[PDB]
Amino acid sequence: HKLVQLLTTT
Amino acid sequence: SHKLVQLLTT
Amino acid sequence: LSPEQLVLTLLEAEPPHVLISRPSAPFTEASMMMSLTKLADKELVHMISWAKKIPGFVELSLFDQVRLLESSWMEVLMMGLMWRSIDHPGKLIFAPDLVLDRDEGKSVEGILEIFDMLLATTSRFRELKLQHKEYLCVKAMILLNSSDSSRKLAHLLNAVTDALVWVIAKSGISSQQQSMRLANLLMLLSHVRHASNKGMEHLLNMKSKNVVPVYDLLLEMLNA
Amino acid sequence: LSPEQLVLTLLEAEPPHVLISEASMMMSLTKLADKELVHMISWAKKIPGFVELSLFDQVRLLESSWMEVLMMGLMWRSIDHPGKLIFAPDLVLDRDEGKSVEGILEIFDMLLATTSRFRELKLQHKEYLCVKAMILLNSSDSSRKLAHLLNAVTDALVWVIAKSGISSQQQSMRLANLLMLLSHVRHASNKGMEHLLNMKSKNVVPVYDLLLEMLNAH
Ligand SMILES: N#C[C@H](Cc1ccc(O)cc1Cl)c1ccc(O)cc1
Ligand SMILES: N#C[C@H](Cc1ccc(O)cc1Cl)c1ccc(O)cc1
Fold first, then answer.
1. What is d(CA C55, CA C7) in angstroms, rounded to the nearest whole number?
2. Which ligand is nearest to the CA of D200?
3. How far apart are CA D114 and CA C43, in angstroms?
4. Where in the cell is it found (chain D)?
């Protein structure tokens, strides 16, 4: 979840 | 059981 | 576009120094494991940022991006460490203020074996006189070689490879020595990936024995 | 010894085609692996310089690389037969048949995927011969002999690529693409070693002495 968030939300 | 060293020596 | 443009994009994309204090007290299995895991988790944040600044990476499928970072992250950290460590023989330069000796691996069961791998490989890179622009290319290649998006990754990996072939040529050694240097650099990457597999096994061993703290990104990345 | 003399010595060193003669599959693979490991030690000893290395080095390189060297052998036999792994003439499996044993479909997919990249790149026999040797010598007095042995097989691969007469740019690009694929062979052998050590722990794979010693090393 954290990886996908940093990839797309950060 | 030492078949590797044996095959390497002959 | 041009190999030189791609190299200068990788140069701009380099992560900043991650700052971690050395424990005040001489290292224990715990203090050192907490140091190395805290560093890894901070670097992982900067690694995701680095990958997205590689041209064409963010045009891959999300799942391809995820799979590359999940698959290569430890090898990428370890390529980072060997480079920071290249100018300081016998030392491992984990961060500016975390400079570990070979013998200081005594403090974690099994870590000393990992340090000798890291130090030996770092010496092979020192004796090949690894150049800054070769390192930039080789590190992206570890990421993109780990592992329509399949066609784009092949292309993006051909482009970084084209860039490394260019950097070695600008060295001006013979074509035969260009081929030999390209081969000796790539065969050294198999030694980085080996060190990375032992360290992943070591990390999963340390997590299993409690020692490992709760670490969002690192944990998510290890469970991969 | 010239690059051509070295590559010709590898052609000579090539083991013969080995035949084996749910559980049946896994009995076949361990039996094949054990027979192939015998041929692999003759092959290693016919690599110019190999028997000049210290016995510790000879043992350490074979112990390290044996599964990588089997899988490289498999990929070459399989290259023309897409969707097929030509373990042997009397042992030809597809991805489906891998489904029957847990963890094997994953390994057959890697081997088949890597096999297809080598196929797309049109890996040449003389290229295969060099890289397979390099897998052995690059695993992970004597140590300097090793380095010389390894440079020489690398010079030989650069030679084989030159003889295709593609551009210099393209000789470098080809060289890189072949070497990068090797890490995919090493990954597939990492997974196979993990699977095989797991089957040994549960003693579900026939006790074979040379395979056993080679596995124990890990
Ligand atoms: N040697 C080492 C660690 C990886 C590691 C290995 C084993 C283990 O049990 C825990 C960790 Cl975290 C490292 C940290 C930052 C880098 O930039 C590079 C490597
Ligand atoms: N995929 C495969 C096997 C290795 C293997 C892997 C897992 C396992 O549980 C048992 C075995 Cl024996 C092989 C046999 C001969 C070759 O030439 C190449 C590979």
1. 10
2. 2
3. 31
4. Nucleus
Q: Which residues contact D103 (CB under 8 A, 6 or more apart)?
A: D191, D195, D198
- Cβ-Cβ contacts under 8 Å, D169 against chain C: 165
* Residue whose token pair is 């100018």: C87
Which residues fall within 8 angstroms of residue C49, CB to CB, at 6 or more apart? A6, A10, C15
Nearest CB to A4: which of C49, C52, C62? C62
The total domain count for chain D is 1
| Secondary structure letter of residue C26 according to DSSP | P
d(C-alpha C105, C-alpha C102), whole Å: 6
Tokens at C64, concatenated: 């391809």
The residue among C184, C157, C179 whose CA lies nearest residue D161 is C179
Q: How many Å apart are CA C191 and CA C180, to the nearest integer?
A: 17
Resolution (A): 2.1
DSSP string, C46-94: HHHHHHHTSTTGGGS-HHHHHHHHHHHHHHHHHHHHHHHTTTSTTEEEE
Q: What is the CATH number of the domain that holds C119?
A: 1.10.565.10
Dist. CA C178–CA D76, nearest whole Å? 28
| Chain centroid offset of residue D159 CA | 21
**Cβ-Cβ contacts under 8 Å, B10 against chain D:** none
Q: Which domain holds residue C132?
A: 3-223
| Structure obtained using | X-ray
**Between chain A and chain C, how many beta carbons pairs sit less than 8 Å apart?**
26
Helix (H) / strand (E) containing C101: strand C98-101
